[PDB]
Design a protein around this ligand. Structure first.
Ligand SMILES: [Cl-]
Ligand SMILES: [Cl-]
Length: 65
């Protein structure tokens, strides 16, 4: 899929948002809302990869693709 770069830190404002740190690279899922983009974060637990999706401000991310 498409990637985006975190321009600035962002603290999630609800469970439906994701927290970013400046310099993070995330997957872009949906950018059709002008203000809020749905992105995807990955974690690993015991060597297995899980994913969580949620909104961040479109202005806080830059498309890399
Ligand atoms: Cl920052
Ligand atoms: Cl962009």
């Amino acid at each position: 899929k498409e990637l985006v770069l975190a321009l600035y830190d962002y603290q999630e404002k609800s469970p439906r948002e994701v927290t970013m740190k400046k310099g993070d690279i995330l997957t872009l899922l949906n950018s059709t809302n002008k203000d809020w983009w749905k992105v995807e974060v990955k974690i690993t637990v015991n060597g297995k990869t899980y994913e969580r999706q949620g909104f961040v401000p479109a202005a806080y991310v830059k498309k890399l693709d």
